[PDB]
Design a protein around this ligand. Sequence first.
Ligand SMILES: [K+]
Ligand SMILES: [K+]
Ligand SMILES: [K+]
Ligand SMILES: [K+]
Ligand SMILES: [K+]
Ligand SMILES: [K+]
Ligand SMILES: [K+]
Ligand SMILES: [K+]
Ligand SMILES: [Mg+2]
Ligand SMILES: [Mg+2]
Ligand SMILES: [Mg+2]
Ligand SMILES: [Mg+2]
Ligand SMILES: [Mg+2]
Ligand SMILES: [Mg+2]
Ligand SMILES: [Mg+2]
Ligand SMILES: [Mg+2]
Ligand SMILES: [Mg+2]
Ligand SMILES: [Mg+2]
Ligand SMILES: [Mg+2]
Ligand SMILES: [Mg+2]
Ligand SMILES: [Mg+2]
Ligand SMILES: [Mg+2]
Ligand SMILES: [Mg+2]
Ligand SMILES: [Mg+2]
Ligand SMILES: [Mg+2]
Ligand SMILES: [Mg+2]
Ligand SMILES: [Mg+2]
Ligand SMILES: [Mg+2]
Ligand SMILES: [Mg+2]
Ligand SMILES: [Mg+2]
Ligand SMILES: [Mg+2]
Ligand SMILES: [Mg+2]
Ligand SMILES: [Mg+2]
Ligand SMILES: [Mg+2]
Ligand SMILES: [Mg+2]
Ligand SMILES: [Mg+2]
Ligand SMILES: [Mg+2]
Ligand SMILES: [Mg+2]
Ligand SMILES: [Mg+2]
Lengths: 50, 187, 135, 141, 127, 125
Amino acid sequence: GRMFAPTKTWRKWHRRVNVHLRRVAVASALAATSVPSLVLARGHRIETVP
Amino acid sequence: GIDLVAGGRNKRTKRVAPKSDDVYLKLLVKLYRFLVRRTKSKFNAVILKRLFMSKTNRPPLSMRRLSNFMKGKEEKNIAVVVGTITDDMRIQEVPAMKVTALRFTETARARIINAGGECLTFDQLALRAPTGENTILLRGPKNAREAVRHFGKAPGVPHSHTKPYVRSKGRKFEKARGRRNSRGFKV
Amino acid sequence: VPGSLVWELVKKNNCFLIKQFGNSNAKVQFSKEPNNLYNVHSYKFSGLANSKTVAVQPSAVVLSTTKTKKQNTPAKLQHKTLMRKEFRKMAKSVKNQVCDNYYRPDLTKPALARLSAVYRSLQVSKSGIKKKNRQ
Amino acid sequence: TTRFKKNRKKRGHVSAGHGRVGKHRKHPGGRGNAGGMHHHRILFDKYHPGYFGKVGMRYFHKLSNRFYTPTVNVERLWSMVPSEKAAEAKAPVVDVSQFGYFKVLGKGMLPEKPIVVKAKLISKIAEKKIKAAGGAVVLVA
Amino acid sequence: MKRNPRVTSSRRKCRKAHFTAPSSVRRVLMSAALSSELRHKYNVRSIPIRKDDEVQVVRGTYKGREGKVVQVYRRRWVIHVERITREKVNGSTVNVGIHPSKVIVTKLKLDKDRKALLDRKARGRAA
Amino acid sequence: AVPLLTRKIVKKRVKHFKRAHSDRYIGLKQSWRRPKGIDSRVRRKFKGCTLMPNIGYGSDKKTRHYLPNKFKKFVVHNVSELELLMMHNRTYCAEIAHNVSTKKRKDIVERAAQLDIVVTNKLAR
RNA sequence: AGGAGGGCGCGGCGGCCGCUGCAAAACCCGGGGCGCGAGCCCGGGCGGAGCGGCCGUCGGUGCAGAUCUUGGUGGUAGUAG
RNA sequence: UUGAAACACGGACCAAGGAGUCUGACAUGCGUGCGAGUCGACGGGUUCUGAAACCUGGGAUGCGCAAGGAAGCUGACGAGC
RNA sequence: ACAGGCGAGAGACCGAUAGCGAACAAGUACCGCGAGGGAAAGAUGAAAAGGACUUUGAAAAGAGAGUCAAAAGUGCUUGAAAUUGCCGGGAGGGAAGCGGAUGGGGGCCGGCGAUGCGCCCCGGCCGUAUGCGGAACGGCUGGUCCGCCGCUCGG
Ligand SMILES: [K+]
Ligand SMILES: [K+]
Ligand SMILES: [K+]
Ligand SMILES: [K+]
Ligand SMILES: [K+]
Ligand SMILES: [K+]
Ligand SMILES: [K+]
Ligand SMILES: [K+]
Ligand SMILES: [Mg+2]
Ligand SMILES: [Mg+2]
Ligand SMILES: [Mg+2]
Ligand SMILES: [Mg+2]
Ligand SMILES: [Mg+2]
Ligand SMILES: [Mg+2]
Ligand SMILES: [Mg+2]
Ligand SMILES: [Mg+2]
Ligand SMILES: [Mg+2]
Ligand SMILES: [Mg+2]
Ligand SMILES: [Mg+2]
Ligand SMILES: [Mg+2]
Ligand SMILES: [Mg+2]
Ligand SMILES: [Mg+2]
Ligand SMILES: [Mg+2]
Ligand SMILES: [Mg+2]
Ligand SMILES: [Mg+2]
Ligand SMILES: [Mg+2]
Ligand SMILES: [Mg+2]
Ligand SMILES: [Mg+2]
Ligand SMILES: [Mg+2]
Ligand SMILES: [Mg+2]
Ligand SMILES: [Mg+2]
Ligand SMILES: [Mg+2]
Ligand SMILES: [Mg+2]
Ligand SMILES: [Mg+2]
Ligand SMILES: [Mg+2]
Ligand SMILES: [Mg+2]
Ligand SMILES: [Mg+2]
Ligand SMILES: [Mg+2]
Ligand SMILES: [Mg+2]
């Protein structure tokens, strides 16, 4: 038969983010890379990093 | 069996925590949970409650309101708002005021600092005024919203000035037969 | 970045945190990191969210404490000592570097407890278990 | 997002939240704005007074750009004057057309300092307020 | 990481191209490594298997056994080596098929195009 | 080691809530399903019918999830996960995961004997 | 009837942590337990190559019914004939 | 359905499949950013993993910042209890 | 602009009742006077090494045997349920099944349940102080460790 609600190609695939909010997210993700505790929490092995 | 409503349990709901997930706000809540437990201050109790409030329950406050609410009492008095301070171009004189807020716009921060004031966070107000002494608690206009204009009695009842929900504005959008006597009636 | 800020970032998910049995009352959580004396996911015990931490691991027992002014430099963050003396002499050093120094006095009982378990674990390592402890 | 929909919470419940008596049917009441004068009259009268009927005269080929008149109030004029120009000031002269404005309206308070305003249009109160501050108006096109 | 726009990384497409290959392409696909002595002498690494090449088996249960290629069954992707056989239930003898990627060529049959091929492949592997 | 739990473990019901009419039909499974029919005897709680689970059956918070050997279970997959119970060996027992091989089971059972950690299924495989 | 909250389970994607030819998935079992429950964990067997858990996010995501669809199988019955 | 064990309908059994979804327009609520501004959505530049990403075009593109009137046309002179 | 044609690339798509009707001699077999309608059907094994030979039987087949890591034995990977046969167990006066509670019988289990802990004759290590090496805490004093000595004696 036919699927209940056949998947159409005009689904919303791409999502808009405000440019300002994207820049805030990058700046927040950039600063997290400098505190070593959050880097270890992500699983990186940095015990011998000067 | 005992005659009670809902078993006597409280059916009113209220916020006991912020719905948001901001870690800096969660740290402010922990700090002010401590202050209201071990200082017993009425001021600190209000701050903790408003720290839970949603965005529409914390309206923005402009400079015009702040410079008029804090008119002569801007020395030895810190203005406190749980919300945002926005800028105002319609005023020219800005006195030196100490203001603590959740957020400042970059134009409001520049306006305060250039006038000689200070912009404080709520973790800085706790050090200066642990029990909220010599402070002015302020709120923005709660009902100055376009959504509130559609609230209340229906637009089609007598003595009602509620905004209708119309897709456009003009002579052909809801102005006849209910809006004037020449077409039927005028409610 | 203070420890209170770090704790809220790593509390939910973590490369060292192990969670089991979902998010019901059945949930069981542990931490895998060194310098976490009881392997428990809590702010007091976390080896990631605290500036001062003690590690009691075998090798001979290695005691490790972290330097507060060397947070930005991981290669010199751990001041490590290796002790091969009798238990009481090792227990005295742990109390000295943790309690009497005021370097986390709240961890002096977890640290002495863990040193007991590590030393006991090494005791049977050289000479196999000849008795089981069910009494 | 499907994981948060309330239909997922209604799995196992027979009617999916639509009732056993007044079920979910196709179009009880009609389609769209049907019956807005017959069985939806109370709804149309209560929430949309004015909906039916015809008022006013038609305008064939009404071009929007003919009625383009952006406006600015006096209370905002001094924000267009830069800091160093106010320090130098004689009165600064502002052509509000260079900021996208046609008519000057008179809501709000002007500072008690002279200012010259160039505009295509202006209201009577805005002109009275500008003159009371010691300023002047120049009509341009 | 591949960069060519004209080269497909699709697993479906690569398997279809491998298995639906013409005879002349299976010759290149059915190549064998050279022995250490032959690689040193010719400065080439691998060569397409040929009939009457001398081969040694280096993988499987016949690892170590030697012989000469009696058959190149390109349709089945296997080569048959002399005296690498098995008895059936009725006692008859059947040649065992081995993939040419699990053998090394020890002696090469060279007519005139084997030498020319060896010259072409050496120059790239020599420079 | 020696279990630290001392309060007696009481169960309000050592019996499963089997789905109503799962005895009558082969295709109905025993996993509990809340009846929702309008005329349902089981939903309406007539006496003599199938019982329905509710929050009043819940077990004491101090003894819930404790195994009969008075320990609480933690499933391990290798030696490093077993090291995490060394400071909790009086309250937690270790169970080796079902798909861990016999070679690694030997290593976990040896390390747990050194650490005095109890393994519930150490004789398996 | 209805609303809401918190949880359980299925399949992907981005991450993290693992398992497995010293036997993965699936399936079977008067095996043992945990949870009020959805479910989960272990044991024994079969099988012979892959699989899991946690955080985030997404979805063709949970069946007893619909004279429901397709397939398979009963009693009727060694009967009518 | 007022009322079902009903002499009211559907259901012999089992397995697999099987029903509030996607899109548009509004609305309330909530969350995030900025804030008298906000949006970079179509284009352009660039991008050596990339139909990502990153940068850039608004002194007027859209919603806001001002109404009322059919229209011609006018347009908030700054509160007390 | 481009659901056609020829040729390429990719995917948070489907995975044999799904995805095109068609993964396969699929617009095929087959149905209709005709216009038209329209399926089901993928998987041994690494390699056929696809089961020689003896014996019973009219044969089909069986019983031995052989190949294989395995019979995985040519619709052959795995192989659920309904339903059926046999073996063993239990019950039964016009249904049975079901809830609660015990008992009788069975099947399981040993983290199902302990054998250690303080005092004493045998085995076996060192303070205090030192020289030296590294690296700490607090904000200039004091701290720990290790290897070596030379006095020391309690463990
Ligand atoms: K509803
Ligand atoms: K998921
Ligand atoms: K019936
Ligand atoms: K704009
Ligand atoms: K008029
Ligand atoms: K088909
Ligand atoms: K098999
Ligand atoms: K029987
Ligand atoms: Mg009561
Ligand atoms: Mg009630
Ligand atoms: Mg009237
Ligand atoms: Mg209904
Ligand atoms: Mg209805
Ligand atoms: Mg009705
Ligand atoms: Mg139970
Ligand atoms: Mg198992
Ligand atoms: Mg059974
Ligand atoms: Mg899974
Ligand atoms: Mg899908
Ligand atoms: Mg579905
Ligand atoms: Mg079904
Ligand atoms: Mg149902
Ligand atoms: Mg039927
Ligand atoms: Mg059927
Ligand atoms: Mg029949
Ligand atoms: Mg007969
Ligand atoms: Mg009736
Ligand atoms: Mg009924
Ligand atoms: Mg009746
Ligand atoms: Mg009917
Ligand atoms: Mg019937
Ligand atoms: Mg289904
Ligand atoms: Mg084309
Ligand atoms: Mg098909
Ligand atoms: Mg399937
Ligand atoms: Mg015919
Ligand atoms: Mg295989
Ligand atoms: Mg089979
Ligand atoms: Mg069966």
